[PDB]
Design an enzyme around this catalytic site. Sequence first.
Site, mmCIF file in Angstrom:
data_model
loop_
_atom_site.group_PDB
_atom_site.id
_atom_site.type_symbol
_atom_site.label_atom_id
_atom_site.label_comp_id
_atom_site.label_asym_id
_atom_site.label_seq_id
_atom_site.Cartn_x
_atom_site.Cartn_y
_atom_site.Cartn_z
ATOM 1 N N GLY A 136 0.811 -1.216 0.000
ATOM 2 C CA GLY A 136 0.000 0.000 0.000
ATOM 3 C C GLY A 136 0.845 1.268 0.000
ATOM 4 N N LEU A 193 13.467 -1.713 4.378
ATOM 5 C CA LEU A 193 12.437 -2.677 4.882
ATOM 6 C C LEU A 193 12.703 -3.202 6.290
ATOM 7 C CD1 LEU A 193 10.857 -5.404 5.480
ATOM 8 C CD2 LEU A 193 9.766 -4.165 3.608
ATOM 9 N N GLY A 196 10.706 -5.699 12.240
ATOM 10 C CA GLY A 196 10.027 -5.516 13.547
ATOM 11 C C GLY A 196 8.819 -4.599 13.484
ATOM 12 N N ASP A 237 7.283 15.624 9.645
ATOM 13 C CA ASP A 237 6.170 14.756 10.073
ATOM 14 C C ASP A 237 6.647 13.458 10.749
ATOM 15 O OD1 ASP A 237 3.725 13.318 10.429
ATOM 16 O OD2 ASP A 237 3.798 12.576 8.363
ATOM 17 N N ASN A 242 6.288 6.222 11.747
ATOM 18 C CA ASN A 242 7.485 6.558 10.978
ATOM 19 C C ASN A 242 8.724 5.989 11.613
ATOM 20 O OD1 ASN A 242 6.235 9.842 10.275
ATOM 21 N ND2 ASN A 242 6.205 7.995 8.974
ATOM 22 N N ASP A 258 10.077 8.042 5.864
ATOM 23 C CA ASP A 258 9.152 9.061 5.355
ATOM 24 C C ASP A 258 9.722 10.469 5.400
ATOM 25 O OD1 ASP A 258 7.244 7.178 4.634
ATOM 26 O OD2 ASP A 258 5.965 7.517 6.384
#
Lengths: 369, 382
Positions: A136, A193, A196, A237, A242, A258
């Site tokens: 997604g 990637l 956890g 942000d 994040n 991000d």
Amino acid sequence: PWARLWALQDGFANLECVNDNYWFGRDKSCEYCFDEPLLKRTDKYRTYSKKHFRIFREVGPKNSYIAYIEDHSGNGTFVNTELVGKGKRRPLNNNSEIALSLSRNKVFVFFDLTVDDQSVYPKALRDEYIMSKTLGEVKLAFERKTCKKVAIRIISKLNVETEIEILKKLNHPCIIKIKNFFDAEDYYIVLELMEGGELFDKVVGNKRLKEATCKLYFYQMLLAVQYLHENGIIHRDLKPENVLLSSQEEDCLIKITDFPTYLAPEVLVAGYNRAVDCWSLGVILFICLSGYPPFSEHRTQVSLKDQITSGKYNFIPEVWAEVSEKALDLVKKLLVVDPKARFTTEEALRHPWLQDEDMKRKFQDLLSE
Amino acid sequence: PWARLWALQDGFANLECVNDNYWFGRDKSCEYCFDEPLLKRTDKYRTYSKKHFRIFREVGPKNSYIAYIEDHSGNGTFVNTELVGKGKRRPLNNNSEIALSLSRNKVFVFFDLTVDDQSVYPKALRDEYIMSKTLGEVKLAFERKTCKKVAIRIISKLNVETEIEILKKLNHPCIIKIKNFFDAEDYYIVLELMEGGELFDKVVGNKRLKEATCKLYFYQMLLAVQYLHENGIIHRDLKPENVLLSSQEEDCLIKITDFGHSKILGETSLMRPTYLAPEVLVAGYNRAVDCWSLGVILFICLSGYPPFSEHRTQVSLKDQITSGKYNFIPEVWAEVSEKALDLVKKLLVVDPKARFTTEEALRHPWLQDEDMKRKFQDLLSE
């Protein structure tokens, strides 16, 4: 080859669909003709039409290709029991069963071959990577050789290209690495990637984390944000989701990615300074220690956007009763309404709470991996 | 049943994968055993291992299930020619060809059955709609009976439903119809789906639209926004990609979408780059913000470039807007009529009290054009 048809009765042969259209029926002009001599004696042969049905691929104006079946038979073309109907069409999904003349009379299984089609993706990528699920537009992928999970951001149709180089230069253990970059037509940024999962999942359901663990994660967080800052990046942000965790284990490396509450007070009334990230880390700390957010509406009792501005955060003594004074004090000094008065990352790292070589040694240990 | 294995040689039978793990090989303990008497005489039989390979499903910690193949054979397990390797594993994608002992010796085709699985969606939706390809989450779907293509916006994890009912009340030919709604797993919102894509794609790549076409689209845009206004909706985020075109044809109906930023009756939609108004930078939530936006859209349409962008130290973007000094390339505007430029001008006023309103804009000399107005009426006859 965009579709497979798998025959389910003797008279019929399998079909690979490469062409844009295929007609089925007894008529000699059909691309798939039933006129085969074994098929001719199946008695149900005579129930099949001259132009019985067609499967075809159509470009939907989204750069997507949709398969359709279209019934033209007198006796019916059935998709998973359901009758299409003389003159009707319908989308043909993966693993559809095509039945002729009778609902139960299965002839084909239809398989879409454009599912995990690698042809879309550029050659240079496919040589190093196997493409998997959408997480997604970010996808899971695997290194062809090592079979290691990676993530790949994909963008769309000049200058935001060397901006990637600068992100690839960033090298910090508490920060997501830009493992690889592909410019073909869409931009493919291969990223690290974290297994956890999100630090978010660790505090979800009103549960709090061990104070020792908070400190370990928060230290890392501070380091990371500080590094970003001196590399001319303001995160802008920063939140539980994040912050990624390297493993299932409670003692692990934290990594930031991000580049709702966590909006800074100054950013509500340029006002784009580093202190906004400090505010955010403040909010993250708060959630971590307490297991609940410092702000939320409930009722008419003060708007959420008003709470933040006055600086009056939600304080449940019973919860904070088992969180050390210094921990609460750091959070306090970090959640100052006036940005000029808010703690900085350097100041936060000097704070009594983080004066803890016990955990710092733990952190060093984790770097040895 | 999460996967299908389709046999490609006589000795082998098809396999439906329902269980979490399947071992393949000659060993009697393998879930898929090769010991079949027809298979035993294929000479290549002896090249197959006792525990040759396994396919298995594993829950990746994202609530996703990934298929893997794992080679344990001496002579090799091959996925699409490529050798997996003794003791190695790799993801097993849809339409993978499994070959044994030889690269060319194809035995199975692997198909993922959790691909266009409809089980994920609520029954109420599936009764009326066949779900199709994603369009980024907004998926394509088909009305079961008509086969009409529609768009279905899917969301996430109280009264964000009244909002839907309100948006459903909106009934104007220049505004995207909300065809349906489903509150279940995720919130599903069935929408019209225009065949002509975004007005954004029409101006992308520094190209401009025909002035006649701009007028046709901008008229429609004005009507739509005005209607929204008098139905207590301020769009609040109006842009080229929010304006949709009904067909490929240049003369077509324009439709507006995304009320995700808008403020509906009293409140901001519970669903909650340049198009920020000057007043909203320094409540300040009035209709005039939409006018500003339409101004910017007009500007981009006529010119083919945005009225604001940073370039260098030479004035910040957020400062440009506030002073109101827009980017003016005379060579471009040289072939755009005076009235067109004048409308844009009167629409991009820094002072919101002085900015044109939708009514005022519709009275503007530029839109005093019954020639295109007749064209519009024509388009309504469809």
